[PDB]
Design a protein around this ligand. Structure first.
Ligand SMILES: [Mg+2]
Ligand SMILES: [Mg+2]
Ligand SMILES: [Mg+2]
Ligand SMILES: [Zn+2]
Ligand SMILES: [Zn+2]
Ligand SMILES: [Zn+2]
Lengths: 110, 165, 110, 166, 246, 166, 447, 246
DNA sequence: TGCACGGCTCGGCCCGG
DNA sequence: CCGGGCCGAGCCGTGCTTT
């Protein structure tokens, strides 16, 4: 659904060609996401290679440690890279102290 | 490298049974059955007691917030620390509602009484539960009088048995 | 403390509980445990892939993950027989006749 | 998925006009007028004013308006840049937002004509923007999110929450 | 195994729905004489009994007597799909499934799983009923509906040649009075002055569902339970036991 | 390593105060907001140590608390645990007194809970409510993770922290 | 280890014989004496969420109407006007308004109130230079006050006077007695606790029976006739988490049984008046009609014991005694700066001035949803007894004596944590004729 | 002490329901010629006048005059409890209770407490009315229902032998035109063209529950409140005055 | 660790007088 | 045909405590 929304956005609001062109979940393989812990301000880029039938997010131990997570009960987020690139803005962030948490102010490539 | 291999990485149950039980009594009954089956758990006296030390805080902590609570309007969000003495919201025409209802105190009383009567708990917890019930039924003595009689009584309760013993 | 609805699976260091095995599986090691799916089934499916549990010895908390290479529970049926349920399909087949769980199974800890 | 405490599909303030569910469409269909605090942008050439980043008349980018908290004098960004973001006639630091009036019907109709998405039943917004700029989000994004059944987060992204295993 | 067919399935559905308003789990006593039911509400305030002899069954075969226990909510939900001009068929084999069939312009079959419930025997002796009043369903239903406006308790006063009902609120007052000279009462037999009071919720729950052309007789006394009856299909009968107030 | 947002969120402000009660000498103070409670014990303790090092390198004197400060902080810790959260760690009052006596910086902040204290109108303090961030730092940082802190001190070649080693 | 004072026996000293005195007394007030009619719903099918609100509103109405009548006694108050019809008054008139104190803030000019009555809310300002500005600075909300001043068509009601129900300055002295009679006050026995000191209580019970040391004490003991206990007679069960380790008698039945066994040792000519407290088996919120009978039967079975309510008023030889536990002091201490637990006389005098035993709602005192307010002091008494603070004190205010009887439980871990200093085993002695404390016993040597 | 008897309580209840949608408390003045009431909208936007002469009632006996202050909700409920052919009797004795007695198969009695309500006597004589049109209640009811969809404002236009009512919105638009050849417009007396606008909520409140065979009279003018009046039982009448908007 | 539970309102559909 | 009775969504509030 998120990829369909991004394709609709690109075709209608901006007048550019579609990017994902997916009809089944297996058409998202090879596309990039962003992982973000609920207490950090930096993200890390990952790649989709498969799907399982469980309610967990499997990943390398280095991937979970780069988000300062411990893997004994924690829960994190994933979002499509293009969605965050097009939609994220620093002008929608709340003005209290805890407003810059959970925000990808920078991403790590390696 | 790794030490142990696996046939499938996502083999087994996929959803917890805890997410398919609706009532609290049903959850407690299923959990106690599970504890009874397992040989090395010893439910009968530690599981139910340590569980009772989770419903007792709820009961005692909701009766102490009923006697010091703030009222609120349905249409507005205004909160009054004491009820308006005309019975209506001063700044509008809506009616006032409680923030801690009467049914919030005694939602876990039935399960607690079942736990007390069925299993072996120390007399401290049993007396605490009996006195909690007596205190719940005594705060509303002159707002909800018992004007309804009954045909059949004595459903094998435990509080009256403890009192008469 | 025990919350209503969350079972306790073993008393502290009691024989007949979780058998400690030293090792690391394909999908465990960071802070997670390894559990045979048969003992996931034979506890009324309270445990599921990814369900957290509060542990005693190494730390406090872990996530369960299926490992079919280790042993499962030993159960006592309704007619008095004893069986070694080391298999997932056998656990599905014999679930309804269980009277007492003699042994709970293994737990691979890195 | 991740959804705010009341679910939100666009970061656009509606106030009390939309009711309990902050439905922008319901307020628009009943002709209600809402009073909220937003940021207004002004076209340098012709002079259109409203909560939008592009002028419909000419398709050129507008400039944020700075208001005086005491005298309600409006200055464009270029003018306020020289003034050091302080009112000369008064003496108070300016603000980019002020409490204003909006007619949801015109905005919603313009958005629907913009993206050609007419068949949407509900479209939820916020009671009030929490930022210091109170800059709103385009309504076309909210319409497309409502059409494709996705929800927004505090910074404008769509997120999915799951347990992590190695 | 047994086979039961009934004419006018809508009346059976209405009767089952009326029974369902107070109790949730109940079991049916089907025997050679017919079928009967008895249960008590969870609050132990009301008792309902009902029997259906073989006289009102067009076709009825059974190998003896058996107890059948089904969920009431599912039963009434299935029964409410019927119509006033269709026949109802109840059948069960050796399997523990209750097959329900409605035969109108077509035939449809419903499968309902069975359940086991405690069949505790609860009965009471004939209490001394000093007063007995026979009145129509419409008058008592109207009296209950007026009484529900002002208060939550309804009061009975029975006197020789004068039966009256009252319901007084905080400031508003409601009163209903009638005599045998009036058309709303069939007969009255009182042994002495009688006064009592019963709640409005239970009375509204049980009285609802009574046709206008129904003869309802009430037996009650002084600070003692109330008994109400109405004949079904000129052969059956239903009982209501209600605990008094104060 | 620049991932968790403690430097951006937890450290609300840094200010310099004078010991008007004892010597009118200057020292450094740290203000902790709400988000610092999510950073972690290592981050909190490292923040305390960095504040100590910066105060040393700025040529500033040591915080010299009055006894009323110690009573106020002990009462704050006790009430916070009693009425808000378990804290996952219980510092004994002797440990709290030792920590207050041997910390060269002022660990304070704004109010994060709607509970008043008894020792009101303390000099140098502009609030009479619970400072959840500061007390949570003091409980779950230097105290709960003293082993890692002394390891960092030994690796870092920092003097003046011998009390923690003892 | 389950000693419960089973075989404690104390016998009267034959060397001293009590004198004969007519036992003229009566209970003038009890909560289970007023018949509170339950409120009826505004329609035929009302539910739980509205009856409670109606009962609370009716309670506040009764409080306001009860405390407004008392104010209009001194002639200094006149021209009472309705708050609602304040827009139809001239600017040169003097009016008085009576209502409830919603809130009270402080500004540089003075204080701003939110007085409310049956017919709307009004704002009030009191200039800092007012002669009564000191009195109005330390009044806590929900009390009933009177304001006098000039109204303005622009909102604020400018006032120059502030009134409390207070106590009259003049009273007539009662006729004397044919012979003196003495009474004793005790509170907070806390039977069944580890910190309860039993030896001091046994020494006191011996003292009551003639085991005296001086001639004057022997004369007083031969004359004592009454005895009043003011709550917290047992340590209770489940009061706080982790109390089980603090109990010697962890059974409420056994706590009451041991307490009954202890008190049976007094002479039969001493009549007990026992009232419940916040640690007994009794109603969760005040007022408390009585003990739970099925739990506190052994103390009911005492032959000379008379069980009273909280609060209750007792008349001995025409002298009124307002006996209460005293849970309302904590609110006064918390709200008014400059007062401490170590000096409970001043908070008690403030409560007497306001003529209500627990003014504020929603603080540290639980208030039950009643239709009638029974906590107002309708009639001014001769003596006032209280407890619950474990500190002894005594003051006199305009002819009435205010006493705070001490405890018998030694300092516990919590009181040490909060820095509270108990003064156990202190017992005041009151003369019936003058209703004044004439001697204080001290058995703290053993405890 | 007066006794007033009415036949066909349903019409009385309907009239009370229409009269009770604007004010909550109103006072009735009972007098030999009849009962008259003149309430006021809480927001001071719509006027309502009542006039019930003694000719309608089958029995009308009263001496002197008296005011009757009652809240509308309780009386509306008591009257709505009346069935199709129930005789309605209004009686007041020495007591402060307003008795409502209903006669039929059973004698059902209700009592209400009178409430003191201030009377604001403001008589409005004849006003300069530009145009006067009488139309069937069905036409206005349907037109208001149709215009409620598009917006919240109705525009009334009257001209020489032409009656047109229009509503406009952001995108939609509804217009209804009437003339003498239609069955709704009975006749039209207009001296000069006029146009004015009114709210839809109030119009729906006043127009709802109007019979199909009613000769509703409408009189209005340029930027002036509209006057509406219809007759009841050929002798009674109800008069509406609604202030315009903008 | 926070989620789990009660209560009030407000339309959209039947179903009946 | 027109008016209620009723469900099903939604949106708010709340979870031991010695003087
Ligand atoms: Mg972790
Ligand atoms: Mg005490
Ligand atoms: Mg006490
Ligand atoms: Zn309101
Ligand atoms: Zn432009
Ligand atoms: Zn200015």
């Amino acid at each position: 659904k998120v990829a369909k929304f991004v394709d609709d956005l690109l075709e209608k609001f901006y007048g550019l060609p579609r990017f994902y062109n997916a009809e089944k979940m297996e058409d998202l393989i090879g596309h990039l996401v962003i992982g973000l812990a609920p207490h950090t301000s930096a993200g890390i880029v990952g790649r989709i290679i498969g799907f399982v039938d469980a309610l967990v997010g499997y990943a390398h131990p280095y991937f979970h440690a780069a988000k300062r997570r411990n893997c004994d009960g924690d829960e994190d987020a994933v979002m499509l890279l293009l969605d965050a690139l097009l939609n994220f803005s620093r002008y929608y962030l709340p003005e209290k102290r805890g407003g810059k948490m959970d925000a990808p102010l920078v991403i790590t490539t390696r | 490298k790794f030490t142990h291999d696996t046939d499938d990485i996502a083999l087994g149950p996929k959803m917890s049974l805890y997410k398919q039980l609706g009532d609290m009594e049903e959850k407690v009954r299923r959990q106690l059955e599970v504890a009874k089956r397992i040989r090395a758990v010893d439910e009968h006296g530690v599981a139910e007691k340590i569980l009772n030390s989770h419903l007792i805080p709820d009961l005692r902590g909701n009766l102490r917030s009923f006697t010091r609570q703030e009222f609120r309007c349905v249409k507005c969000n205004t909160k009054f620390r004491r009820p308006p003495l005309n019975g209506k919201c001063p700044v509008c025409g809506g009616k006032i509602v409680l923030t801690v209802s009467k049914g919030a105190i005694e939602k876990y009383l039935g399960t607690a009484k079942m736990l007390v009567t069925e299993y072996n708990v120390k007399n401290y917890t049993r007396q605490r539960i009996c006195l909690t019930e007596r205190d719940i039924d005594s705060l509303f003595e002159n707002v909800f009088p018992e004007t309804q009689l009954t045909l059949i009584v004595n459903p094998n309760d435990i509080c009256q048995r403890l009192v008469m013993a | 403390e025990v919350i209503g609805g969350r079972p306790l699976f073993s008393d502290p260091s009691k024989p007949g509980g979780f058998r400690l095995r030293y090792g690391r599986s394909r999908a465990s090691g960071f802070a997670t445990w390894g559990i045979n799916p048969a003992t996931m089934i034979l506890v009324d499916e309270f445990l599921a892939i990814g369900t957290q549990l509060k542990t005693e010895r190494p730390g406090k908390g872990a996530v369960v993950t299926p490992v079919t290479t280790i042993e499962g529970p030993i159960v006592k049926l309704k007619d008095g027989s004893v069986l070694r349920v080391d298999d997932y399909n056998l656990a599905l087949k014999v679930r309804e006749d269980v009277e007492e769980i003699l042994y709970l199974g293994d737990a691979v800890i890195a | 998925e991740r959804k705010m405490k009341p679910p939100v599909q666009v970061l656009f303030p509606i106030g009390l006009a939309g009711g309990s569910s902050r439905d922008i469409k319901k307020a628009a269909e009943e002709g209600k007028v809402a009073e909220v605090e937003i940021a207004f942008f002004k076209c340098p050439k012709c002079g259109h004013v409203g909560p939008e980043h592009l002028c419909p008349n000419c398709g050129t980018r507008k400039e944020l308006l700075w208001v005086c908290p005491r005298c309600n004098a409006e200055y464009p960004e270029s003018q306020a840049e020289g003034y050091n973001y302080t009112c000369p006639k008064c003496n108070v630091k300016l603000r980019p937002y002020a409490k204003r009036k909006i007619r949801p019907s015109e905005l919603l109709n313009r958005a629907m004509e913009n993206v050609k998405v007419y068949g949407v039943d509900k479209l939820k917004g916020v009671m009030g923007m929490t930022s210091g700029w109170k800059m709103p989000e385009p309504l076309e994004k909210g319409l497309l999110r409502a059409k494709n059944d996705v929800y927004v987060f505090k910074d404008g992204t769509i997120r999915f929450d799951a347990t992590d295993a190695p | 195994p047994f086979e039961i067919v009934f004419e006018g399935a809508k009346e059976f559905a209405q009767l089952i729905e009326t029974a369902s308003r107070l109790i949730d789990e109940a079991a049916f006593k089907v025997t050679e004489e017919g079928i009967s039911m008895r249960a008590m509400d969870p609050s132990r305030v009301v008792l309902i009994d009902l029997n259906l002899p073989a006289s009102i069954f067009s076709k009825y075969e059974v190998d003896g007597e058996e107890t059948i226990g089904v969920n009431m909510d599912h039963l009434k939900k299935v029964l409410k799909r019927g119509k006033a001009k269709e026949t109802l068929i109840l059948r069960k084999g050796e399997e523990n499934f209750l097959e329900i069939s409605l035969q109108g312009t077509a035939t449809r079959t419903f499968k309902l799983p069975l359940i086991d419930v405690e069949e505790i025997e609860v009965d009471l002796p004939e209490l001394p009923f000093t007063a007995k009043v026979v009145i129509l369903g419409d008058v008592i239903k109207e009296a209950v509906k007026d009484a529900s406006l002002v208060s939550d308790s309804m009061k009975f006063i029975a006197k020789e040649n004068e039966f009256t009902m009252r319901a007084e609120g905080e400031t508003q007052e409601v009163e209903v009075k009638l005599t045998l000279e009036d058309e709303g009462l069939l007969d009255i037999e009182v042994q002495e002055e009688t006064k009592s009071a019963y709640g409005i919720s239970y009375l509204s729950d049980m009285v609802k569902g009574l046709g206008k052309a129904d003869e309802v007789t009430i037996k009650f006394g002084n600070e003692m339970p109330m008994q109400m009856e109405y004949y079904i299909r000129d052969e059956g009968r239903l009982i209501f036991l209600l605990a008094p107030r104060v | 390593e620049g991932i968790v947002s403690a430097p951006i969120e937890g450290i609300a402000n840094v200010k310099i105060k004078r010991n008007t009660w004892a010597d009118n000498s200057e020292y450094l103070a740290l203000y902790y907001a709400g988000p610092i409670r999510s950073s972690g014990g290592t981050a909190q303790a490292l923040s305390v140590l960095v504040g100590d090092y910066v105060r040393r390198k700025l040529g500033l004197d040591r915080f010299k608390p009055s006894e009323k400060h110690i009573e106020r902080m002990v009462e704050e810790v006790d009430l916070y645990h009693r009425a808000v959260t378990r804290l996952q760690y219980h510092p004994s009052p002797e440990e709290v007194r030792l920590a207050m006596r041997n910390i060269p910086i002022e660990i304070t902040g704004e109010a994060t809970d709607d509970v008043e204290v008894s020792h009101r109108d303390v000099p140098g303090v502009e609030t009479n409510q619970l400072r959840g961030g500061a007390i949570l730092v003091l409980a779950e940082g230097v105290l709960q993770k003293a082993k890692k802190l002394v390891k960092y001190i030994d690796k870092m070649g920092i003097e003046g922290w011998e009390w923690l080693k003892e | 280890e389950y000693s419960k004072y089973e075989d404690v026996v104390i016998e009267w000293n034959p060397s001293v014989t009590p004198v004969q005195i007519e036992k003229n007394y009566e209970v003038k007030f009890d909560v289970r004496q007023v018949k509170l009619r339950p409120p009826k719903v505004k329609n035929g099918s009302g539910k739980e969420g509205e009856i409670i609100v109606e009962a609370y509103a009716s309670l506040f109405k009764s409080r306001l109407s009860k405390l407004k009548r008392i104010l209009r006694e001194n002639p200094e108050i006149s021209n009472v006007v309705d708050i609602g019809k304040l827009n139809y008054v001239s600017g040169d008139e003097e009016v008085t308004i009576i209502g409830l104190v919603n809130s009270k803030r402080e500004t540089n000019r003075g204080l701003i109130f939110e007085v409310e009555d049956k017919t709307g809310i009004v704002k009030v300002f009191l200039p800092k230079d007012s002669e009564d500005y000191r009195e109005a600075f330390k009044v806590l909300p929900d009390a009933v006050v009177a304001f006098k001043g000039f109204y303005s068509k622009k909102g604020i009601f400018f006032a120059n006077k502030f009134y409390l129900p207070d106590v009259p300055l003049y009273r007539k002295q009662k006729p004397p007695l044919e012979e003196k009679v003495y009474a004793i006050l005790i509170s907070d026995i806390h039977v069944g606790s580890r910190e309860f000191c039993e030896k001091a209580f046994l020494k006191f019970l011996e003292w009551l029976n003639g085991h005296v040391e001086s001639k004057e004490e022997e004369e007083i003991v031969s004359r004592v006739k009454y005895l009043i206990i003011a709550g917290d007679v047992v340590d209770g069960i489940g009061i706080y988490p982790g109390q089980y380790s603090d109990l010697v008698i962890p059974d409420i039945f056994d706590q009451y049984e041991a307490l009954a066994n202890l008190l049976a040792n007094v002479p039969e000519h001493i009549t007990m008046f026992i009232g419940p407290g916040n640690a007994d088996a009794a109603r969760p919120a005040i007022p408390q009609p009585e003990f739970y009978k099925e739990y506190a039967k052994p103390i009911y079975k005492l032959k000379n014991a008379i069980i009273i309510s909280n609060p209750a008023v007792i008349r001995l030889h025409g002298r009124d005694f307002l006996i209460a536990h005293g849970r309302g002091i904590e609110d006064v201490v918390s709200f008014v700066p400059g007062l401490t637990h170590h000096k409970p006389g001043l908070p008690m005098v403030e409560l007497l001035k306001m003529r209500h035993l627990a003014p504020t709602f929603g603080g540290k005192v639980p208030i039950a949803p009643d239709p009638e307010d029974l906590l107002v002091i309708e009639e001014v008494p001769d003596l006032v007894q209280m407890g619950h603070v474990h500190v002894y004190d005594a003051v006199v205010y305009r002819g009435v004596q205010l006493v705070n009887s001490a405890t018998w439980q030694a300092q516990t871990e919590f009181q040490k944590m909060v820095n509270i200093v108990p003064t156990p085993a202190k017992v005041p002695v009151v003369d019936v004729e003058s209703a004044r404390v004439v001697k204080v016993l001290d058995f703290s040597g053993w405890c």
